[PDB]
Nucleic acid binder design. Structure first.
Lengths: 49, 79, 49, 219, 50, 225, 221
RNA sequence: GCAGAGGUUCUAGCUACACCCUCUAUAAAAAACUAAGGACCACACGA
């Protein structure tokens, strides 16, 4: 944006809530402490439940 | 098709000279008989001009060179 | 132009695929009515929906 | 009444032999998702396919330890085993013996051939050795199970990657037919370990799903 | 009062159900509110403004 | 009806003229989609020359905002009504209550951004069961002016028009009641002295329910009139 | 991989009935459940009416005399007429009711092939013995939802909306059946809710058939 | 096809933004076709 160096194309309200729900932590959740072989394995684990 | 213009402006780095040169090039490629010196992929003249720019082939001085070459070839057949 | 007007007024199937042909790389200026900053009128490659 | 448009593998623009991108022609609305999700569940859920399931390190016995020369932690010489894509035919519970000393990485090519057991990534660097004297060894037991199963469900146990596929993602999007309003263009972008081709992975998943439908198959 | 009315019917008191997804067919985590809001339809249609 | 109202919507639906209220209690002698005949009870009878009280309902009539001012009888043949009762549910009314919109299952969750900022995401089930379809009544006035050398005459004798143009029109230049007219179609002749036919403005579509032909004295009504 | 097979079509009613498959392998439970539910709700051959012809009514917004209901909501009632055909793909049904009394769907002058499944589905209430509704109801086949406009002629024809969707509510519920001696064979049930015009067994048969046919897009036979 | 008229249709059609052919003072063998269009104040609002 020409007003300030802050970008104007910013995730506004819903996508940011989804990301916050994604990028968070609860000390007890199904399959915690597992060791992953890369982010692709993390996606495979989550989509398999 | 294409999305951005940064790879185009980076060599014409006024972001306004880009518009003028690619506009006259798209003119010579649309109303003129010139064929695109960059492969065409069902893309309009504007993105074709941008692609011809990004490939380091079409710039302001190159366009002037083409114009005066056409002028010389025209006046060579008139003599 | 009379024949073209008739063809586009009937919106034949030969008109839709030609339209999607002419909107390949043709930006359109979206615009909000109470525009204040210059980020209030951008352009996009319109997709026919 | 029953006429339904069917695509024919319209775009199979495979990037690399371990990552393809299948994109079908427009399908009737409500079918792009019903096929993408079905294939996703089949692929992330269950296919025949061999992978490591457990390993007995010769010198190391606890899940949390470390032996000199191997700067990689034993937990990491376990992740690299999860990444060890292995294909076997006929034999199921085959045990692979790894044995190498000397400075340098332990490539997957160092595992002895052990009959018809093939490794698709010979240059898979499991762990690095910094000492000539250190002779690392183990008995990695691969198995041709069906579908992913972690170690928490069930000598050192490692998670299993029985499914040859590693990443399934279908991003269905609208397509067009000359009159039809909105038909969905399914886009399956999918990776694999390399043991089975991505196109072949999709074909085998479709085969499994169809074979689970043969009872009610007609015409 | 609204809680007791909910509990009279064979409905959860918390007012939230576990809406399974229509496409993935998988349970939505964090059970979501479901109820009958009285949605109007405003006169500002689109075919008179397209 | 609103599944959760305020109890006073009945008041706002009876006080307004939308709902034909029973000014005289009695038993419904003859109900119909257009008229309601009320047999008055003995107690509410006028002394002599008594009888019935015909609540002539108003069917689809153009509103001011081009909505359907429609009335539906909510009673049957033989159901008693009392003073101040409600008989015909008008527009956006149900059994005497006020029912502006409808009600359907609603779930509060982000569903793949389609309800991103404030947008609703209605199901195809709403459209399929014809839940939110709204009648809109448009009006197309057309006049016949005192033009010199012959006035404006409404005749089907339109020139430079094919049989498609004369299809929806009658033999006197007026469209039949109930023709599925669409954009550009002709409805009224209005031949001017030398073709000023009132045609459907582009975009608007749908059936034509009623044509009214006013006429001042001094000109004879044509065949459709 | 054990294949699923129909084992129960328990007809809890005429409007709906659950269909259960005894064996299903781990993971395939919800897979088949969601696939079948989606393919049933979306695409199943319906029979809802498509065109009505009242006797003395020109446009659908008219009001015939004698009927306690205006023509528009008579059509609104008709678009949910639970009917099914067996031999035809389109049929025109004639109705001639006379005298005071609600016009139940049984009054439709049906043939040996076209048979209604809800003979109590009231269409309109006749309120005069000298008034008689007369409808030439046109019934077609089809699938999904098709509005009146998007179907490409005389005055009397009333183009009603189409609702070719015999199923109204599908809900699968995987379970745990201890088949033979192998555990984890998740028994699958389908608490489908049709409108009485499609056999639940035949519904599942056709849904699986179309799923296979469209899945044969990338596989040999 | 640039200044006019005529032609097979349908009063009239010469590029009027406009559609075919002829020539510079003469009218017909010929199918697809036609119209250049409209101001100011009050009110309900909506973003």
């Amino acid at each position: 944006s020409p007003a300030n160096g802050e970008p104007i194309i910013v995730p506004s309200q819903d996508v940011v809530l989804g990301l916050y729900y994604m990028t968070r932590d609860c000390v007890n959740a199904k399959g915690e402490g597992m060791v992953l072989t890369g982010p692709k394995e993390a996606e495979r684990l989550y989509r398999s439940g | 098709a294409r999305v951005t213009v940064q790879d185009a402006v980076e060599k014409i780095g006024n972001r306004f000279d880009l518009v003028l040169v690619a506009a006259r090039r798209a003119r010579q490629m649309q109303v003129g008989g010139k064929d695109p010196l960059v492969p065409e992929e069902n893309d309009k003249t504007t993105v074709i001009a941008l692609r011809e720019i990004e490939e380091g082939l079409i710039n302001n001085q190159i366009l002037d060179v083409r114009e005066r070459q056409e002028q010389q070839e025209q006046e060579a057949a008139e003599l | 132009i009379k024949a073209a007007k008739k063809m586009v007024e009937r919106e034949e199937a030969v008109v839709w695929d030609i339209l999607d042909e002419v909107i390949r790389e043709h930006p359109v200026l979206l615009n909000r009515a109470p525009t204040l900053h210059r980020l209030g009128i951008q352009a996009f490659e319109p997709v026919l929906i | 009444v029953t006429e339904f448009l069917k695509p024919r593998l319209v775009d199979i623009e495979q990037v690399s032999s371990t990552h393809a991108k299948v994109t079908l022609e427009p399908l009737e609305r409500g079918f792009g998702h019903t096929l993408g999700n079905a294939l996703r569940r089949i692929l992330l859920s269950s296919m025949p396919g061999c992978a490591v399931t457990e390993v007995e390190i010769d010198g190391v016995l606890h899940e949390y330890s470390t032996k000199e020369g191997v700067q990689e932690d034993i937990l990491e010489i376990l992740l690299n085993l999860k990444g060890l894509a292995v294909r076997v035919q006929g034999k199921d519970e085959v045990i692979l013996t790894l044995n190498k000393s000397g400075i340098g990485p332990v490539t997957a090519a160092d595992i002895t051939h052990d009959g018809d057991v093939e490794i698709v990534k010979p240059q898979h660097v499991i762990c690095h050795l910094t000492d000539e004297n250190a002779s690392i060894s183990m008995r990695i037991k691969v198995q041709r199970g069906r579908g992913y199963v972690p170690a928490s469900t069930r000598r050192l146990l490692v998670d299993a990657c029985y499914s040859p596929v590693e990443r399934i993602a279908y991003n269905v999007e609208a397509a067009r037919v000359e009159q039809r309003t909105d038909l969905d263009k399914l886009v399956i972008e999918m990776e694999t370990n390399g043991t089975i081709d991505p196109e072949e992975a999709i074909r085998r998943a479709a085969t499994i799903l169809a074979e689970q439908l043969e009872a009610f198959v007609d015409l | 009062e609204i809680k007791e009315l909910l509990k009279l019917g064979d409905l959860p008191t918390s007012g939230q159900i576990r809406l399974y997804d229509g496409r993935t067919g998988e349970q939505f985590e964090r059970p979501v509110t479901v109820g009958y809001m009285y949605m109007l339809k405003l006169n500002h249609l689109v075919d008179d403004k397209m | 009806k609103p599944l959760v109202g305020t109890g006073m919507e009945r008041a706002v639906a009876v006080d307004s003229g939308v709902t034909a209220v029973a000014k005289r209690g009695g038993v419904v002698q003859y109900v119909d989609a257009s008229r309601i005949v009320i047999k008055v009870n003995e107690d509410e009878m006028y002394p002599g020359e008594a009888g019935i009280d015909i609540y002539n309902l108003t069917k689809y009539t153009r509103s001011n905002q081009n909505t359907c001012i429609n009335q539906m009888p909510c009673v049957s043949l033989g159901e008693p009504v009392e003073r101040g009762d409600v008989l015909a549910d008008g527009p956006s009314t149900d059994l005497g209550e006020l029912a502006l919109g409808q009600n359907m299952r609603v779930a509060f969750m982000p569903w793949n951004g389609y309800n991103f900022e404030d947008s609703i995401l209605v199901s195809e089930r709403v459209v399929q069961e014809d839940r939110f379809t709204t009648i809109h009544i448009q009006e197309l006035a057309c006049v016949s002016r005192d033009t010199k050398l012959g006035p404006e005459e409404i005749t089907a004798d339109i020139p430079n028009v094919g049989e498609a143009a004369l299809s929806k029109l009658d033999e006197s230049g007026i469209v039949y009641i109930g023709a599925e007219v669409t954009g550009g179609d002709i409805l009224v002749g209005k031949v001017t002295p030398k073709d000023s036919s009132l045609r459907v403005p582009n975009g608007v579509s749908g059936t034509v329910i009623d044509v009214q032909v006013f006429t001042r004295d001094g000109v004879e009504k044509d065949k459709r009139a």
